[PDB]
Each structure stands twice: as structure tokens, then as C-alpha cells.
């Protein structure tokens, strides 16, 4: 039995006397190992819960639990997708089992000083291939987020995107120094100025021969806070503030494999936010690409300032025309207080786009909830000096940040904003298919959203 075989069991399914004696009750993610019938290999009995309540997430989580229980085995065959009786069709089971296996195997050992084959048993080969690709993209995002900021600097991150673009056949332009200055991304330049690592701006285009979607990803490779320095003695995953950029890049790398008939452009501002003799100051004013002005009332609300000019560039009327814009950003720390650590916030004025993103997230097994663009919170954007502030010092910053970003989206362009600060990094232990640390959150939601949009 190829070293280890993992069998999915719904509640009520038969297992041997040994599994029963060990307490196997088919609880989701429960794994009991036993010798195979011939005594030459290992069987894992893996719980899928009641058949009537099982979802694709159940299969995804059960696959992750299987690969975690593999021990020193060289080969693992997952039969989980062959369990029927639930409402989850075979193709969705196969896709989810494939995702969960890759996501569950993920390790980040690059900075530390025998499993050779995972096989998914199913006729749904296409679904398996899609699952593997989606999960591999997620793991790419995980690597990028986990990467120490001293390795993944803005220049190094730009180089990495260039290499990934080259592999995938994606068109890539990297802007730096004077070339960057010409673009008028004054938020990026101002925020990035304090650091010894100069900022970068990268555009990625997936453009198959077969609507144009713009993806904007916040790539603050290290967020210290700037002069409004993050308190020492509080823990912050400061290197993880490029999770939005990671999600966008990774999603873009998966599109050529899927062959989606839609044009997608990625827009990635990359910078460090550092304290320094030449750092952006509280009370300074940024004049943005659209001529409007932002007073910097708190240097740690840097992401919205960096994204502003990119949203103008991405959405402005011009050559070939981006029909809709989605931004992804580890933007706000206020959200998590209400929503908790595992749910992202979705903002959009477009109800059908909201539905498209939420349904995409459900298929992907990623938790989002929509928050309203409350008109009465615009009063908290007011500045005594400029057109707006980047920080009100009042409650409601998650909503205020969304309204701030909305100011820079050209009139009539459908737009959605994904604030993923909390779910982008897991500071608790591993659970299900999610490791400690960088999660790659939103990659799969984005892929699913782009699929629906292409249909």
C-alpha cells in the first residue's frame, strides 16, 4: 500500500477493531494510523464527519491532517476524494484534497541550519491539477511573507517578481530611481524615503490571446511605523506587511496554468517604512498623482498613502482601459478587534462584485465579511491643512481607510478592497491546512474571483 494510504471515513462508516479501540469516531481531521491488511504498509483512517454536513473545506482540512500524520514514509496516497455520500461532488472533493495536501505539507526551512510522493486517487485529474496549482501559488505567497525583510527588500522583491514573470510568460516592468519618479507615485516615494532600501514599483500583465482586471497589492516589505514608531515590547509581524502584494503576485503566476480568457494587470508598490533623519514627518503633505493632497497625521498609516497614486494610475482613463480594480492590502489593525484573526474585510460599493468576491471566498474556504462604506465616516477624513488625513485618531479606521482608497478610484470604475492584515499571518499554532506565520491568504479567493469574472 505505497507506504501510507489515507482513507476518508464519514460518520457511521466501518473501520477495523483496532481503529475503534483507539477511539476513531470519524471526527473531521481525526487520524488513526493502523497496519494495512497485508501487514506491509500503513493505513490512515481520516475523519470526514457526517456525510450530510461535509463541505469542500472538510476535505481540504482532512487532507492536511493526512499529510501531517505521514511519519517517515516515502510515498503517500490519499483516497479521501473517493469517499462519497456527501453533497460535495467528486471534482470539488479532488480539488480540495489536492489543495489540502500541498497546503498541509508546507514548511518554511530556508533559514534553519523523506516524503518523495503525494498522490491523490481520483478520476478527476483536471480538478487535482487545478488544486495543486492554486495551493502552489498560495505557498509561493507564504514563502514571500515568511521571508525575512532583510532578504526580501523592495529591490530584491522586484527582482523576484521579474524572475517569476519570466517563468510564467508574464510581461513585467520594474520602475526604480528616476524612472520611478517619472510615474508620479509620490505616496510610495515619500513613505519609502526614510529607508536605506530604495522603493520599487512593478507592473505585471497576464495577457492571453483569448475585460481587463487590475490588481493592486500593498508591498510594504517592512513596516516599522516610521517616525510614528511601532511600540517596542508589542509584537508585530512587520515583515508581513507585503502580504497583499504577495497574494496578487501569486494569483498572477497561477493564471497561465489555468488559461483564463481575461487580461489581468498587477500593480505592486514596494517600500520599507523606516525611522530616519530623512523619514516622512507627521504634518507633511503628499500631493498625489490626481493633484489631491493628504496630510500625514500618523506615519504608521503608510499603506493607504502608498496605494493612493497606484489606484489613480491603475484606474485612470487611457490606453486599453482597466475595467475593474481590486486592491489587496494588510492595511488596518482596527478590523481584527471586531472580526477576529481569521477573517478579512471586503469593501465595495458594487453589490454584484461583492457577491462575486464572497462566493469566490466560499469556494476557496477563506473567510471574508463585507463592511459598509459608511458615508458618515468621511467626516473623519477631514484635514485642517490638506484634502484629507491618513489617520483620524478616532475609532473606525478600517472603514475610514477604505473611504480614503475610494477617493483615488476613477469615476465609474468598479472597485473592491480586501483588507487582510490579520488573516495574512497566523500568530497562533498551525491548524487544519494553515501553518504558523505567513498564510498566503487571499490568493485562492483572487483566483476564484478571476475565474468567475472570466465566465
Interaction site with Mn ion (CB under 5 A): 220, 223, 241, 300, 302-303
Min. distance of Cβ 149 from a second copy in angstroms? 5
How far apart are alpha carbons 443 and 433 in whole angstroms? 14
| 399, interface contact from Mn ion, a second copy, none, CB < 5-8 Å by kind | a second copy
Binding residues for Mn(2+), by number, are 218, 223, 241, 300, 302
| 395, interface contact from a second copy, Mn ion, none, CB < 5-8 Å by kind | a second copy
Min. distance of Cβ 44 from a second copy in angstroms? 10
Which of residues 239, 263, 304, 417 is near a second copy by CB under 8 A? Answer: 239
Indicate the helix (H) or strand (E) that contains 4. Answer: strand 4-9
- Using the minimum distance from each CB to Mn ion, give the nearer residue, 26 or 185: 185
How far apart are alpha carbons 327 and 411 in whole angstroms? 16
How far apart are alpha carbons 59 and 81 in whole angstroms? 8
Contact between 135 and 99 under an 8 Å Cβ cutoff? The reply is yes
Return the number of other C-beta atoms located less than 10 Å from residue 415's C-beta.
24
How far apart are alpha carbons 93 and 85 in whole angstroms? 12
Pick out residues in 313-332 that bind a second copy (CB under 8 A).
none
399 in contact with a second copy (CB under 8 A) = yes
Which of residues 143, 397, 407, 433 is near a second copy by CB under 8 A? Answer: 397
Which of residues 171, 211, 395, 452 is near a second copy by CB under 8 A? Answer: 395
382 in contact with a second copy (CB under 8 A) = no
E-strand stretches of 52-105: 75-78
Q: Provide, for the chain, the percentages of residues in helix, strand and coil under a 3-state DSSP scheme, each rounded to the nearest 5.
A: 35, 20, 45
Q: What is the CA radius of gyration of the chain?
A: 23
CA 280, 345, 360, 313 dihedral sign is negative
Contact between 119 and 77 under an 8 Å Cβ cutoff? The reply is yes
Contact between 215 and 252 under an 8 Å Cβ cutoff? The reply is yes
Binding to a second copy by CB under 8 A, coded x per residue (else -) over 189-208, reads -----xxxx-----------
How far apart are alpha carbons 331 and 241 in whole angstroms? 8
- Using the minimum distance from each CB to a second copy, give the nearer residue, 126 or 395: 395
Pick out residues in 148-187 that bind a second copy (CB under 8 A).
148-151
Which of residues 87, 123, 177, 340 is near a second copy by CB under 8 A? Answer: 340
Which of residues 222, 347, 408, 415 is near a second copy by CB under 8 A? Answer: 222
DSSP 382-425: --SSSSEES--SSS-HHHHHHHHHHTTSPTT--EEEEE-TTTTE
**Beta-ladder partners of 368:** 344
Phi, then psi, of 325 in degrees rounded to 5: -125, 130
259 in contact with a second copy (CB under 8 A) = no
Residue whose C-alpha is closest to residue 425's, from 244, 290, 248, 229: 244
How far apart are alpha carbons 455 and 262 in whole angstroms? 9
Helix, coil or strand: residue 165:
helix
Strand arrangement, sheet containing 388-389: 285-287, 293-295, 388-389
Min. distance of Cβ 249 from Mn ion in angstroms? 17
| 72, interface contact from a second copy, Mn ion, none, CB < 5-8 Å by kind | a second copy
Indicate the helix (H) or strand (E) that contains 329. Answer: strand 324-329
- Using the minimum distance from each CB to a second copy, give the nearer residue, 9 or 263: 9
278 in contact with a second copy (CB under 8 A) = yes
**Beta-ladder partners of 31:** 46
| 378, interface contact from Mn ion, a second copy, none, CB < 5-8 Å by kind | none
Which of residues 11, 55, 75, 367 is near a second copy by CB under 8 A? Answer: 367
Contact between 388 and 407 under an 8 Å Cβ cutoff? The reply is yes
Min. distance of Cβ 40 from a second copy in angstroms? 8
**Beta-ladder partners of 215:** 266, 326
- Using the minimum distance from each CB to a second copy, give the nearer residue, 165 or 240: 240
How far apart are alpha carbons 273 and 188 in whole angstroms? 10
Part of the chain binding a second copy (CB under 8 A), chosen from 199-207, 348-356, 371-379, 446-454: 371-379
- Using the minimum distance from each CB to a second copy, give the nearer residue, 214 or 440: 440
Min. distance of Cβ 90 from a second copy in angstroms? 26
Pick out residues in 410-439 that bind a second copy (CB under 8 A).
422, 436-437
Pick out residues in 120-149 that bind a second copy (CB under 8 A).
146, 148-149
The residues annotated as belonging to the active site are 230, 304
- Using the minimum distance from each CB to Mn ion, give the nearer residue, 94 or 246: 246
Min. distance of Cβ 220 from Mn ion in angstroms? 5
Pick out residues in 47-86 that bind a second copy (CB under 8 A).
71-73
| 34, interface contact from Mn ion, a second copy, none, CB < 5-8 Å by kind | a second copy
Binding residues, by number, are 218, 223, 241, 300, 302
29 in contact with a second copy (CB under 8 A) = no
Amino acid at each position: 500500500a505505497a507506504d501510507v494510504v489515507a482513507c476518508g471515513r464519514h460518520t457511521g462508516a466501518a473501520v477495523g477493531a483496532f481503529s475503534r479501540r483507539r477511539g476513531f469516531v470519524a471526527r473531521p481531521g481525526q487520524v488513526v494510523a493502523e497496519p494495512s491488511a497485508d501487514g506491509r504498509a500503513v493505513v490512515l483512517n481520516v475523519g470526514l464527519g457526517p456525510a450530510g454536513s461535509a463541505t469542500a473545506a472538510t476535505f481540504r482540512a482532512a487532507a492536511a491532517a493526512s499529510v501531517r500524520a505521514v511519519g517517515p514514509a516515502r510515498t503517500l496516497r490519499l483516497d479521501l476524494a473517493l469517499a462519497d455520500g456527501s453533497g460535495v461532488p467528486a471534482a470539488e472533493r479532488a480539488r480540495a484534497v489536492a489543495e489540502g495536501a500541498v497546503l498541509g505539507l508546507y514548511r518554511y526551512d530556508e533559514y534553519r541550519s523523506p516524503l518523495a510522493e503525494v498522490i491523490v486517487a481520483t478520476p478527476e485529474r483536471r480538478a487535482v491539477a487545478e488544486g495543486l496549482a492554486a495551493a502552489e501559488a498560495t505557498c509561493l505567497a507564504r514563502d514571500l511573507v515568511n521571508c525575512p525583510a532583510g532578504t526580501l527588500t523592495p529591490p530584491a522583491f522586484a527582482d523576484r517578481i521579474r524572475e517569476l514573470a519570466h517563468t510564467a510568460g508574464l510581461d513585467c516592468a520594474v520602475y526604480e530611481g528616476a524612472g520611478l519618479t517619472e510615474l508620479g507615485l509620490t505616496g510610495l516615494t515619500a513613505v519609502g524615503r526614510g529607508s536605506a532600501e530604495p522603493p520599487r514599483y512593478v507592473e505585471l500583465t497576464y495577457d492571453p490571446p483569448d475585460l481587463t482586471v487590475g490588481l493592486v497589492g500593498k508591498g510594504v516589505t517592512f513596516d516599522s511605523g516610521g517616525l510614528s514608531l511601532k511600540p517596542s515590547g508589542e509584537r508585530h509581524a512587520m515583515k508581513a506587511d507585503m502580504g497583499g502584494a504577495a497574494a496578487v503576485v501569486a494569483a498572477l503566476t497561477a493564471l497561465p496554468r489555468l488559461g483564463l480568457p481575461l487580461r489581468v494587470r498587477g500593480h505592486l508598490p514596494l517600500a520599507e517604512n523606516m525611522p530616519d533623519g530623512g523619514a516622512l514627518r507627521v504634518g507633511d503633505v503628499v500631493r498625489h498623482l490626481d493633484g489631491t493632497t493628504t496630510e500625514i497625521t500618523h506615519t504608521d498609516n503608510e499603506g493607504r498613502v502608498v496605494l493612493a497614486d497606484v489606484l489613480v494610475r491603475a484606474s485612470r482613463p487611457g490606453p486599453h482601459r482597466s475595467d475593474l480594480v481590486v486592491d489587496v492590502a494588510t492595511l488596518t489593525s482596527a478590523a481584527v478587534h471586531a472580526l477576529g484573526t481569521r477573517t478579512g474585510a471586503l469593501f465595495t460599493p458594487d453589490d454584484r462584485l461583492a457577491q462575486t468576491v464572497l462566493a469566490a471566498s466560499e469556494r476557496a474556504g477563506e473567510s471574508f465579511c463585507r463592511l459598509p462604506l459608511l458615508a458618515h465616516e468621511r467626516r473623519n477624513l477631514r484635514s485642517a491643512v490638506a484634502d484629507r488625513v491618513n489617520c483620524s485618531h478616532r475609532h473606525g479606521d478600517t472603514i475610514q481607510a477604505a473611504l480614503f482608497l475610494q477617493d483615488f478610484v476613477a469615476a465609474g470604475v468598479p472597485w473592491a478592497h480586501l483588507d487582510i492584515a490579520a488573516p495574512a499571518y497566523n500568530d497562533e499554532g498551525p491548524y487544519a491546512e494553515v501553518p504558523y506565520g505567513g498564510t498566503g491568504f487571499a490568493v485562492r479567493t483572487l483566483i476564484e474571483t478571476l475565474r468567475a469574472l472570466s465566465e
